[PDB]
Amino acid sequence: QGLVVSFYTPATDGATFTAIAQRCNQQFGGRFTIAQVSLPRSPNEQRLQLARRLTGNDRTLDVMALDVVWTAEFAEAGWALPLSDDPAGLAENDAVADTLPGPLATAGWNHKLYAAPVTTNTQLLWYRPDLVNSPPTDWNAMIAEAARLHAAGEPSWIAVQANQGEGLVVWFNTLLVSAGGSVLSEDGRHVTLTDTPAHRAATVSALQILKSVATTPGADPSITRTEEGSARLAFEQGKAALEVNWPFVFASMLENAVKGGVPFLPLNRIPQLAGSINDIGTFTPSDEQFRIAYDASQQVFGFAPYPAVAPGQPAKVTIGGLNLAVAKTTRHRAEAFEAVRCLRDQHNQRYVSLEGGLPAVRASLYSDPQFQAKYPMHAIIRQQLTDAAVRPATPVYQALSIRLAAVLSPITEIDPESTADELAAQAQKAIDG
């Protein structure tokens, strides 16, 4: 026998989360162990299996990693215990102490914390410094640069995820919040897209940018013809000189370049990098090999803040990532909340970042020299995580998102004024559920 605390996570991060689980087991003195359980790789199927297990009162479900936008759903439904339900009374303070504000904001609902952040994410600008002298600082500069490049016969696509789905919703949300707007009110009860002249201007601004990118000379046909594509691959293959995307494109760039799949960046030819591809095809460099690959990448691969909407205001970039929640189905609340605290301590935060490629939520880690070595863009991330935009927090997020995506796509057919009103009407229909 033996008491087991289940720990449900996306399969994508199964190896990483298993290792920190095993690290935590060391320090429980055999009182109990954490067992990682892999949900499907698809986020939507992860949420649907958790729901099945919660409404089915599966008593072995203890700790679960939730997407940052599932907070309201799981809290309103009584599926995620409030942190104040910890018999030890430690969960609340732990989740606040040394956690960046952006991640923390995703974990609340009705002014109460219902989960503890563990990982986060934000989008940056990635550009070709050999083709682009300075990184565009706002979206008008993005447009003008891409158009100049087209007239010069050079890579002109702006690589951004804009197909119908959550990625387009994320992009619209960033533009909207950066312009001072909001989809919903504080309680997710009212639609605030067009309720005041100022809010309508923010919505119109964001729609104009979406539409401007779609109709820029030399645009990506995945946008102009609403086709399947990939922002990451477009940049790696040399068809886009500008990209907004999560930081996983950094590791992908170096690994694929070392494998010889990046034509403008032949890291595969550098003698010092011989043997750095391990027996499963992963770029696993030493500290010096890393600094060589990153130094050589700088000639052709740069990063910068997400472009602003307004000339002077830094962008409010939609945040992603995972929060740790204790399920209402647990039989051992005390051990479950203790497990959450161990899984998100400083050493395990260092691990998920360095070995897992998942940005940590602990502010202290953005001062760690080892973290700064492997995240040279740490300072931009820290700033965008502290001043983040949050997707609308509502129990009906899934219906709201689907409805917004259907209106916004195809983005070539946006008419900012009339689309603004159609956005608000469709958001209203989701809130009426």
Side-chain angles (χ1 to χ4, degrees), residues 72-298 300-324:
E73 180 192 350
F74 280 60
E76 193 69 18
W79 287 347
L81 297 173
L83 296 192
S84 52
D85 273 9
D86 173 19
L90 296 176
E92 274 238 47
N93 294 346
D94 174 77
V96 170
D98 189 36
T99 304
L100 287 161
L104 208 57
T106 75
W109 180 238
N110 293 343
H111 317 288
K112 267 191 98 43
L113 290 172
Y114 285 82
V118 63
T119 69
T120 190
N121 231 338
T122 186
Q123 279 182 224
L124 284 84
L125 175 64
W126 314 88
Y127 69 109
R128 296 276 303 274
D130 49 326
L131 308 176
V132 182
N133 289 121
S134 44
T137 63
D138 56 20
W139 278 98
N140 280 342
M142 295 280 291
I143 301 315
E145 186 62 3
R148 179 188 71 71
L149 287 155
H150 185 62
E154 306 229 82
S156 51
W157 301 0
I158 301 184
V160 49
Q161 162 151 240
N163 64 79
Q164 208 183 152
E166 190 60 25
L168 181 53
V169 175
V170 167
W171 187 19
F172 171 74
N173 191 72
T174 298
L175 303 168
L176 177 66
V177 171
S178 289
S182 173
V183 174
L184 304 178
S185 45
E186 279 295 343
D187 47 12
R189 297 210 254 151
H190 299 293
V191 174
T192 51
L193 281 166
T194 64
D195 63 323
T196 72
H199 283 159
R200 191 192 180 78
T203 302
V204 161
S205 286
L207 293 172
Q208 278 172 3
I209 297 180
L210 288 188
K211 177 65 181 301
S212 288
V213 173
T215 61
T216 301
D220 185 355
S222 81
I223 286 177
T224 67
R225 322 216 66 194
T226 324
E227 297 164 351
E228 283 283 19
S230 163
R232 182 178 61 76
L233 276 177
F235 191 92
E236 287 187 19
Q237 300 216 306
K239 326 229 189 81
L242 303 163
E243 176 185 22
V244 301
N245 212 332
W246 314 100
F248 86 104
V249 300
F250 182 80
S252 176
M253 179 61 90
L254 298 182
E255 174 165 296
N256 276 329
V258 167
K259 291 170 154 179
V262 180
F264 57 92
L265 179 53
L267 297 176
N268 53 321
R269 296 196 202 114
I270 300 181
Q272 297 100 294
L273 304 182
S276 60
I277 295 298
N278 78 353
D279 57 350
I280 200 64
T282 302
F283 180 47
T284 89
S286 70
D287 286 352
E288 182 56 16
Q289 287 182 317
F290 184 86
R291 190 203 66 70
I292 284 140
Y294 168 58
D295 188 57
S297 82
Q298 288 264 89
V300 301
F301 186 39
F303 50 76
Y306 199 97
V309 163
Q313 165 150 331
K316 307 272 197 172
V317 180
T318 302
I319 202 170
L322 297 169
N323 296 316
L324 293 169

Side-chain angles (χ1 to χ4, degrees), residues 48-62:
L48 288 167
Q49 192 190 122
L50 290 179
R52 278 182 225 115
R53 291 176 178 282
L54 282 155
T55 50
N57 295 42
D58 159 28
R59 300 321 293 294
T60 72
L61 167 60
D62 293 309

Side-chain angles (χ1 to χ4, degrees), residues 5-6 32 62-63 81 86 325-327 330 332-341 343:
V5 171
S6 59
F32 65 97
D62 293 309
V63 175
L81 297 173
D86 173 19
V326 176
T330 192
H332 38 263
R333 287 195 191 193
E335 290 83 351
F337 277 109
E338 189 186 353
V340 164
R341 290 192 284 282
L343 290 160

Side-chain angles (χ1 to χ4, degrees), residues 382-405:
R382 198 202 192 287
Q383 134 75 23
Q384 285 178 191
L385 284 175
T386 312
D387 276 283
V390 181
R391 270 167 286 184
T394 168
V396 284
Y397 184 76
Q398 303 295 314
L400 176 58
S401 190
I402 284 166
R403 280 190 181 263
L404 297 175

